[PDB]
């Protein structure tokens with residue numbers, strides 16, 4: 001039931017207009033400095049893979065992955081960059097859907 005909500009939240013996030021930086025993993029070989037700064041990478045397709053095989057035992061574990069996506073994005077990207085702008089927008093969206101459910 002809680003994970004039921006997580007499926008919907010993930011679909012809406014995947015379908016959001018500001019989702020474009022977060023649909024596939026950052027390839028550390030293609031981004032200078034990414035591996036040295038981000039130890040716990042996360043993205044929506046990785047969350048989708050885990051959710052599909054029942055790898056989230058609680059909604060809390062889903063929320064940890066979602067915030068990793070946005071925390072990694074704020075750590076590595078400036079607020080003024082297109083990717084930075086997108087992470088701030090998706091965090092507010094996630095925080096809005098998460099609070100009108102949990």
Ligand SMILES: CCc1nc(CN2CCN(C(=O)c3[nH]c(C)c(C(C)=O)c3CC)CC2)no1
Pocket residue numbers: 020021022023024025026027028030031034072073076077083
């Ligand atoms: C640019 C080289 C590269 N392409 C990809 C694949 N795919 C990853 C996500 N993506 C982004 O634009 C994106 N999303 C985030 C969270 C970031 C960073 C650095 O935080 C970035 C910069 C590449 C689209 C492309 N991997 O490396």
